[PDB]
């Protein structure tokens, strides 16, 4: 038995936490994404990169801590610890944003390792790998938002920082500068996520309220044996219910659960496409025909023009502090403002 | 029997292609009126003075909108919370100008949808089903009540209810963040966990059941034909899906009771969306998101900005531009 | 000498209904952007 | 409104071509 085969045996042992070959990629990279997030939100600042506090140490709370992106001046540097910027100096690495690339890139390889883990376990247990396929949607989101988007922009500065309110900042940036709500690729992703939540809730409720009586207790959970042959609920009565409530119903159990995979997985994929567009500022920002009319007809107003006025307010009021490396100076008198406020 | 009994029996017949039921008796007319008005107004309604300042907003396709920009516009701020039926106007022309279709649509729709929920209970009784599907639906229904009724009540005007349009929805969301910092509200963060987690668990359950379909077909036909409607037996191996998923994470982070698993799928999105509906409903009374503006300061007292201060600069940009002609006094108190 | 890999193809009514709803709703979504 | 008049033909074919595809596959299914 070759040494490769003995290592294989031990890595695929049935234990409490399955390891595997994929583990060799997954466990180190995942631990270090996690650990670098905890470490940076607990102890590290964003003062030299952003002009912001970002750690518990500095008095932030769980909503306002972040591992923040590196300064715009770093471009798309990998910001390796041993690289030319930090020159092996750990303390300076932290101060320049190395933990951001550290987390981002170990996280990327950890998601790879997780998907291969889903592939590796499916093969050993003997089931189809549709779960791994489903996990392509989270991977596309992560790659598009965290890597592709900043690689199209001037630097890693404009990627998402790893924090709750930092992400909220990102949401509002995307509204004010990209008009992302208007983008059909996001619109589709919204449909897929809210449609997946809908599917989740309505399938759970439908099953729970069409159960057969299989025990005699009032708690119905105890009347199910994972080894039973029988369906625990009635497809036939479920079907009739929804046919008469809603007009149509599912009749095929396989189609129904394939549809549950498809809808959310397809939504996140469509959102990823639009962010790739925004990597290039290829936005769906405007409707030319409305702008031609509006510029000519000062009485023409729609919810589309109202929203742009809000976008314009966001950009000017937030850019000086949000992009400090630009030294935007906006005198009071240039700031756009409606009456009174 | 007699006439009223033939009628009762028809209304509650489990043999009608679509169940009517006593709730249906209210649902059908109210939804029909809401739908017909909405379709006509969306296409043809003329501009509506939403904010009460004689600055009408065009919401309809014939007045220069497309599918994305069009809306049925909320009724005038001059009206506030007053009831504005057609018969209270001096003319349809006055009613259209002040946004009457909006009141008509949303009242008939909240009624109709409240009765849709009752109808779900009602049919489950006639079928001998357990009754709590309607509970699940209470989460979406509650959410619609919040943006169309509760938020206008707290703020004192239907003019601040949600518009019935794609872009109008966005307007409402941006103004909301400006005035309530909803992103920083835990009930909205619970809503996002609800729907994200719902999407996740949705993909998981589907992926995991699909992963363990029993070979009952060839490679040239759809796997789906391996399931026959009403078949006694199950067409996937739940024990194998547990064996996969239990190893993916660990054995007890995985469900092996089909009933416990499906109850979880029901409860996660429903509870979360309950919270985010309650979030709109309580921000309706100006109990707003966490405020951490200038919360960190240094030994001298300089403000050391956080990401919360950066959010606040976006919020301020929304604040000072929205409804740009509508404020005469420095505070926007509702 | 007829080719033995030929297969017959199927689309049931439900799939047609689903596929038509998909197309139509996509058209309704994207058309505003095509007119711009 | 000063729209893109190529939008009409784009929308029309966006609909017709794939719909026809579906119809054709469905009808030949029902006839065997």
């Amino acid at each position: 038995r070759g040494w490769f085969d003995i290592l294989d045996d031990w890595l695929k042992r049935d234990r409490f936490v399955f390891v595997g070959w994929s583990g060799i990629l997954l466990f180190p990279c995942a631990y270090l994404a996690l650990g670098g997030w905890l470490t940076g939100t607990t102890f590290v600042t964003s003062w030299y990169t952003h002009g912001l506090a970002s750690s518990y140490l500095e008095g932030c709370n769980f909503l306002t801590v972040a591992v923040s992106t590196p300064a715009n001046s770093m471009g798309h540097s990998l910001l390796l610890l041993w690289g030319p910027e930090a020159q092996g100096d750990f303390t300076r690495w932290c101060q320049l944003g190395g933990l951001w690339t550290f987390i981002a890139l170990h996280g990327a390889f950890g998601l790879i390792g997780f998907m291969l883990r889903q592939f590796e376990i499916a093969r050993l247990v003997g089931v189809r790998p549709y779960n791994a396929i489903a996990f392509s949607a989270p991977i596309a989101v992560f790659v598009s938002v965290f890597l592709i988007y900043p690689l199209g922009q001037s630097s890693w500065f404009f990627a998402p920082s790893f924090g709750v309110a930092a992400i909220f900042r990102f949401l509002l940036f995307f509204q004010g500068f990209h008009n992302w709500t208007l983008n059909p690729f996001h619109m589709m992703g919204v449909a897929g996520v809210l449609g997946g939540a809908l599917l989740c809730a309505i399938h759970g409720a439908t099953v729970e309220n069409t159960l057969f009586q299989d025990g005699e207790g009032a708690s119905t959970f105890r009347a199910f044996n994972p080894t039973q042959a029988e369906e625990t609920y009635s497809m036939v009565t479920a079907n009739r219910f929804w046919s008469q409530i809603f007009g149509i119903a599912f009749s095929n159990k396989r189609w129904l659960h394939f549809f549950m995979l498809f809808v959310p997985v397809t939504g996140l994929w469509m959102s990823a496409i639009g962010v790739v567009g925004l990597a290039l500022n290829l936005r769906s920002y405007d409707f030319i025909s409305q702008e031609i009319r509006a510029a000519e007809d000062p009485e023409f107003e729609t919810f589309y023009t109202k929203n742009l006025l809000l976008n314009e307010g966001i950009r000017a009021w937030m850019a000086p502090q949000d992009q400090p490396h630009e030294n935007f100076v906006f005198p009071e008198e240039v700031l756009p403002r409606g009456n009174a406020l | 029997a007699n006439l009223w009994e033939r009628f009762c029996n028809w209304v509650t017949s489990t043999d009608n292609r679509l169940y009517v039921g006593w709730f249906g008796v209210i649902m059908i007319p109210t939804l029909l009126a809401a739908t017909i008005c909405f379709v006509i107004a969306f296409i043809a309604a003329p501009p509506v003075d939403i904010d009460g300042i004689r600055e009408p907003v065009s919401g309809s396709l014939l007045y220069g909108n497309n599918i994305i920009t069009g809306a049925v516009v909320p009724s005038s701020n001059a009206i506030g919370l007053h009831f504005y039926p057609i018969w209270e106007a001096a003319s349809l022309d006055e009613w259209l100008y002040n946004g009457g279709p909006y009141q008509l649509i949303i009242f008939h729709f909240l009624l109709g949808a409240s009765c849709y929920m009752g109808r779900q209970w009602e049919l489950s009784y006639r079928l001998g089903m357990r009754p709590w599907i309607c509970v699940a639906y209470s989460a979406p229904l509650a959410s619609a009540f919040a943006v169309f009724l509760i938020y206008p009540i707290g703020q004192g005007s239907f003019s601040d209810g949600m518009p019935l349009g794609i872009s109008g929805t966005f307007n409402f969301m941006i103004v909301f963040q400006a005035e309530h910092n909803i992103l920083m509200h835990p009930f909205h963060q619970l809503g996002v966990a609800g729907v994200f987690g719902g999407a996740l668990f949705c993909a998981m359950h589907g992926s995991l059941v699909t992963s363990s379909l029993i070979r009952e077909t060839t490679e040239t036909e759809s796997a789906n034909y391996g399931y026959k409607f009403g078949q006694e037996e199950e067409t996937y191996n739940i024990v194998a899906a547990h064996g996969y998923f239990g190893r993916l994470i660990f054995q007890y982070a995985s469900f092996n009771n089909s009933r416990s698993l499906h109850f979880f799928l029901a409860a996660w999105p429903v509870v979360g969306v309950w919270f985010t509906a309650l979030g709109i409903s309580t921000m309706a009374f100006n109990l707003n998101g966490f405020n951490f503006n200038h919360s960190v300061i240094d030994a001298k007292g300089n403000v050391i900005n956080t990401w919360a201060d950066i959010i606040n600069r976006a919020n301020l940009g929304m604040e000072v531009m929205h409804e740009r002609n509508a404020h005469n006094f420095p505070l926007d108190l509702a | 000498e007829p080719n033995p890999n030929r297969q017959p193809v199927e689309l049931n009514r439900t799939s047609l209904y689903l596929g038509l709803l998909l197309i139509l709703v996509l058209a309704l979504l994207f058309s505003s952007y095509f007119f711009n | 409104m000063e729209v893109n008049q190529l939008g009409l033909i784009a929308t029309a074919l966006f609909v017709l071509v794939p719909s026809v595809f579906l119809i054709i596959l469905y009808v030949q299914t029902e006839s065997q």
Binding site: - | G230 | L21, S31 | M1
Partner: peptide
């Protein structure tokens, strides 16, 4: 022409609903 196009697409969907409910393949217990 744009208004007509939006309304036509919306009207085809409504007709699709009618056929999909009332002219569905009936679910049968085989």
């Amino acid at each position: 022409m744009e208004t007509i196009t939006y309304v036509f697409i919306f009207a085809c969907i409504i007709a699709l609903f009618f056929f999909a409910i009332f002219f569905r393949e009936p679910p049968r217990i085989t």
